[PDB]
Amino acid sequence: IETVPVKLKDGPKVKQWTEEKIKALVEICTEMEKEGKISKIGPENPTPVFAIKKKDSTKWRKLVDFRELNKRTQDFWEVQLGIPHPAGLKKKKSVTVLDVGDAYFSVPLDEDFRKYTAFTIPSINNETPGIRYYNVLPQGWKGSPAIFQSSMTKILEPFKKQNPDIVIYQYMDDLYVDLEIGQHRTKIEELRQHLLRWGLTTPMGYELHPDKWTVQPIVLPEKDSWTVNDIQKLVGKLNWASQIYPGIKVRQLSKLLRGTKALTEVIPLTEEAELELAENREILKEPVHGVYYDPSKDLIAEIQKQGQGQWTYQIYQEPFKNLKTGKYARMRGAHTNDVKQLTEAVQKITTESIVIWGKTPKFKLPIQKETWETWWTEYWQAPEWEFVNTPPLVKLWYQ
Amino acid sequence: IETVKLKPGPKVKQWPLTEEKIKALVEICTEMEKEGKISKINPYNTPVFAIWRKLVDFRELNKRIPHPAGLKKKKSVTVLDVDAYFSVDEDFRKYTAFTIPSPGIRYQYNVLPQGWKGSPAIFQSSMTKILEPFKKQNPDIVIYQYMDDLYVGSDIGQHRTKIEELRQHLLRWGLTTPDKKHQKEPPFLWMGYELHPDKWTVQPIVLPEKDSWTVNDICKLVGKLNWASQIYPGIKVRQLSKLLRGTLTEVIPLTEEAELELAENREILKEPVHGVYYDPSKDLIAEIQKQGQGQWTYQIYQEPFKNLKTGKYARMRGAHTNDVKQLTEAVQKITTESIVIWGKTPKFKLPIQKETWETWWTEYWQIPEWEFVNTPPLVKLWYQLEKEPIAETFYVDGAANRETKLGKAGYVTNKGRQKVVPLTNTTNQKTQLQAIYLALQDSGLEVNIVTDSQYALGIIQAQPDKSESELVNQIIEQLIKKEKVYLAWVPAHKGIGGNEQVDKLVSA
């Protein structure tokens, strides 16, 4: 075995806020103690916990990481181990992720990180607590994968040495690769066996694919301005979209509403009116001009179910500086569990964020802070987020 | 017997001292000599001022929960604290000293210094260390570190025999096996809880409602009764508390409406007190009823007609909200109450057309796996915010000055209906909605007024029914008495239909 010293630099020992989750997590904690990865020592000192249940699985998978410390210590470990943001994602058919989460859990664990290796073990009604759940490569700590940068490379060596067009990338609990998917699946089968060779495990299936995601091209408000209601909504979004698409000009728009008519007043179109209408509809429908993503500049999220179980989820940093026009619809085993539906939808889109610029910045989901803190575990799939109940501005893409 | 450093010695004086235990130091020195709690002393020191506990002010040294109905009903209680501290670090095993004579005899205290900022957690850690072998031998036992005593469970005289053997197993590390536990009385005399398997509840309660006082006694009795009201249902202090806004001498009593309610509230408590224990076999059935006037209550019970526990729901915020807002809040809060007592979630059995809220839920900007258990209460909004039109495309709006803006809103209508709002010292937002309400009051049932500001839409969209500002209650009533309503929002500085002809009244 072998490892290396720290690259540390925070101390928010806080962890998190289910009788069954706690009756089922103890099992993994005890299993790890039986083997020995996480120590049971919690009385001395003053990290987060989570349980998950996703596709193709029966048990409750443990979850642990601390965004506060993670981000705090992000600088050195991530900068010393920086990805050349491999942008070879478009030219592909599918990609799977690393189901394995203990291959790196077999490294020679660290100690000095115990004071920054916080954990937690709550107690029902403050009655039955546990000391604590520890060491390097526990379950996350992105820097940790960077420390497994040598392991990821040791593996990419024979893998890519077998499949040149098979590009090998790494991710937190995920690896990253339009050839035949079946060949992709075998490549993974052989890589699972390979790992087996040098003592690694591989604990249906989604296998996210590039060819499916796209940029939803926002559409027009109406075919015509028959009613001032439709035209008002159209202009309202034009004005607010002006911060994004400045082409919106009211040199004649206001004059177009010539008389002081009413909301639903029937309305045909004139020459200049219809001309400007077509001109700007295409204008906005034009590509995204001047918006370019730079991993140095972080991004922001904007998620909303768009009413009927659909979802309007974007990724952008500056106001009106939309980097991704993603969407979401058709939540299987959903469409009535609103929270869950968008939970999975927004997780997905997080991944698309990662492929667009690498990261997945904090979200501003609309759930009640209580509601989100009380139902994030129910369907936990994959950070620090805020909350919005904002007005309609995304209501410019479609209906 | 067993144990598990520094700060991130010291010197500390005291203030004029107590002469009663003045020679307690020379006696506690021997008490600790025998239990090796202190040594004889390196400049280390903390302050000391108290008695007959010869404690010390470790403030300077610092500077250097389950629910009464949160346990099942096995036939056994085990409560026993060994002191329980001086029975188990070196840089810190010598610096604890003190003295204030008229040699300044201080020495090297070296055992658990109850009072050090954090010692409770160490006591709990050892408590757990003792419990570790207890679960190794018979994990069937339940333990709770509520205090430094024991809360144990083993369902009896036969079970008590094995319980004594364990108490004695505690004695190994110098623990107590005293035949003086608070077993006789299920009621946890200590720490204000009338505990009993058959029935769980708070023991301490009284309310001297005789004279007309409202200064601090009122706050004390409202918070006490409510914090204690876990299983005392039939009380509310939203009103009573909503009027006491930052007073501790103002002696001004309450309304007779609230007061009257208060009378009832007090009287109800008189009724017997029996909160139910925890039930592992089956979950609970929950119904939440609106106590009228924003007031709301909820019960968490597994026994029908035998309310295992109770709860309230009056947590509001923001400007306006709705019955569904309270519902969602109450659900989150009760959910957490459940997770604290049981962990599960009781049957959300209350009186709503689930489809009706379903449409609400798909209306709002907002996981109640619930049921539409019918009951007389009325949980619903009273306005229908359409998404299509019917309504002379009103033109209400208004600007003013940043300095004071002196209210003075106005509104027009595509049929000629214009109305002003000389609001005395009013803000642009406020007056906009007030003037719109005024246009609404003379309006027909089918009335669509296109707003000209965001605040108005923001609120209207959220189907506001409750009201703190009387103008808001006024529109609530107008929306209910109206049927056809279409709402719109628009900016200024653009110009459409009639909006500049209207906005040309910022000052005059």
Next chain:
RNA sequence: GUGGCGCCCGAACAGGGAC
């Protein structure tokens, strides 16, 4: 001289929004 927890309130930092 003091604190734990809780409670009733207040103040306040930050963020967003509006003018």
